[PDB]
Write a protein that binds this ligand. Structure first.
Ligand SMILES: CC(C)c1cc(Nc2nc(N[C@@H](CO)C3CCCCC3)nc3[nH]ncc23)n[nH]1
Ligand SMILES: CC(C)c1cc(Nc2nc(N[C@@H](CO)C3CCCCC3)nc3[nH]ncc23)n[nH]1
Lengths: 301, 301
């Protein structure tokens, strides 16, 4: 099923997805009420761009991506049983094409994703990453999705949470913010994180913050390879000798079968220590050098 | 040493302290640049109020409390070797006269203090409490300090942190925010919390959140009676079956040798669950009924 049509393709949450789909070799079309430098760039990359809203624009589409069900393109598709997918659902689908790193947890997804992208780029890898629903690739010279790697926040309040297919998954922590997504029941919310980590392939990797008592409780249920991290004495990957020099936080990272590595980050708080530990677990498992880790962490603001 | 003089006694951080000192039977004087309803109320309660700044106002004072060392009252005192105490230092001194509950921890001091005050007032006790450096007594009909109980935030960045003399102390968590107070060294910061809890009398009580990995690490060093709390399976006082009904969070509190008690609070997040657990530990140790606990927790916004 080769042809994908975006209604409102100039939206800031929509153009990135189309660009990645163009990069994967799909035929991509889109409509929007006005031409912009965004549609122009998508056309330069191979997208067919309509500047009206009319049923004829939906012709030939195998799937629609939308972010108004009375809109005539959507109706024409619905009446023709063409699948109509929400933007968030197609975003999560992109992870199947790449080596996906899913950053889950109630808090710290945004920073931990940016740090991972920061270190991987220091290692030459130019990853694509998703913050706030936007596809990104810091300083890239290429179409979104060029990199083998795709780092993304994985929000448990998101309808697509359990349809991510990552190779590696972080769980920073598990809070009760989104109980209402799960019937108002924190125990139902914990069971979803267990199911989420079981979307990993058996060769995948789950990166678990055992400083969180709720992460620590579900850890023995995870039939996937795991590395634990935190300040806890029993974490696989730990931070010790936390210190401050200026607006910068220093600490020593302990890692199994490695010498201790002094790192530093420009952001205060134990939570950014933990964001950096999670990043260090990912980077190490992937084979990235200490120089890239050290540089990636200290480069970020 | 009976007579205490406040320079700038109309300040919002200063009038409360003078009022408590009046309530303890001290002679209290003060100066300020302008008469206000605050100075008027202090005069109605027995304070002598000067409306100028001049050395003669400092005459007879045994101690000064200030919040400008060129000010003539301070100079007259300094030249006369009269002690000159910062406002924060005299605030912490008040705890010696009462049954002091010190709410320490990097995060959650404000909410946990207000919840404790909320439950104690539900129990008829009309406590005085300190948020943000301000003495408070919700709906009281009395001078500040009338109650036997004084609940106060205990900030580890505060110069007076280690001169609190509480009967009971909470440690919600231990973060690195204030490393710069302690030479930029988190390990120096942890040692201070250990020393702080040892300001408790041997019959005192330390209430420790063992969900915090740093609290959990120093726990075995505390030669004082301790009750631990959190979601951890091994906490003395735990929250289980967390659920949501509207904008309200429900959970069941487990307590040693007590039946489980369903409580609820109007604020979301596991952190307010923990604030409520800490409050429930304090209230229970003090002998307060379930009705006051339940009412105190659900009354607060
Ligand atoms: C607050 C918000 C802006 C955030 C959080 C954050 N990161 C993380 N927060 C947490 N839990 C924290 C609760 O907020 C605290 C932090 C201190 C140690 C005790 C737990 N655990 C984590 N593990 N790995 C990453 C990560 N970044 N930004
Ligand atoms: C954030 C800020 C506005 C705050 C914090 C707060 N209270 C507490 N926070 C913490 N740590 C938290 C880090 O913020 C998290 C919360 C979730 C479980 C994992 C730890 N532990 C606690 N123990 N007792 C009270 C209390 N109230 N408000």
């Amino acid at each position: 099923i080769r042809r994908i049509h975006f209604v409102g393709i100039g939206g800031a949450g929509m153009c990135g997805i189309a660009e990645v789909l163009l990069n994967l070799g799909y035929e991509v079309s889109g409509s929007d009420l006005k031409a912009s430098a965004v549609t122009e760039r998508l056309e330069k990359f191979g997208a067919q761009i309509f500047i009206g809203h009319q049923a004829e624009n939906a012709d030939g589409a195998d799937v629609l991506v939308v972010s108004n069900r009375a809109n005539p393109e959507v109706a024409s598709a619905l009446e023709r049983r063409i699948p109509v997918v929400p933007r968030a659902e197609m975003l999560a689908e992109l992870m199947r094409y790449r080596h996906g790193i899913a950053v889950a947890g109630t808090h710290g997804k945004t920073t931990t994703t940016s740090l991972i992208a920061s270190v991987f780029a220091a290692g030459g890898l130019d990853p694509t990453f998703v913050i706030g629903g936007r596809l990104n690739a810091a300083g890239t010279n290429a179409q979104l999705g060029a990199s083998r790697y795709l780092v993304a926040e994985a929000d448990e309040s998101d309808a697509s949470f359990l349809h991510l297919q990552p190779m590696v998954a972080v769980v920073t922590n598990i809070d009760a913010d989104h109980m209402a997504t799960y019937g108002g029941d924190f125990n139902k919310l914990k069971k979803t994180f267990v199911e989420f980590l079981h979307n990993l392939p058996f060769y995948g990797l789950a990166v678990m913050c055992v400083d969180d008592p709720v992460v620590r409780e579900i850890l023995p249920q995870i039939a996937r390879p795991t590395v634990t991290y935190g300040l806890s004495e029993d974490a696989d990957v730990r931070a010790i000798n936390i210190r401050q020099e200026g607006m910068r936080t220093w600490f020593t990272v302990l890692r199994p079968e490695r010498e201790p590595l002094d790192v530093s980050v420009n952001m205060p708080g134990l939570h950014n220590v933990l964001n950096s530990l999670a990043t260090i677990v990912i980077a190490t498992d992937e084979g990235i050098s200490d120089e890239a880790i050290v540089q990636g962490l200290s480069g970020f603001q």
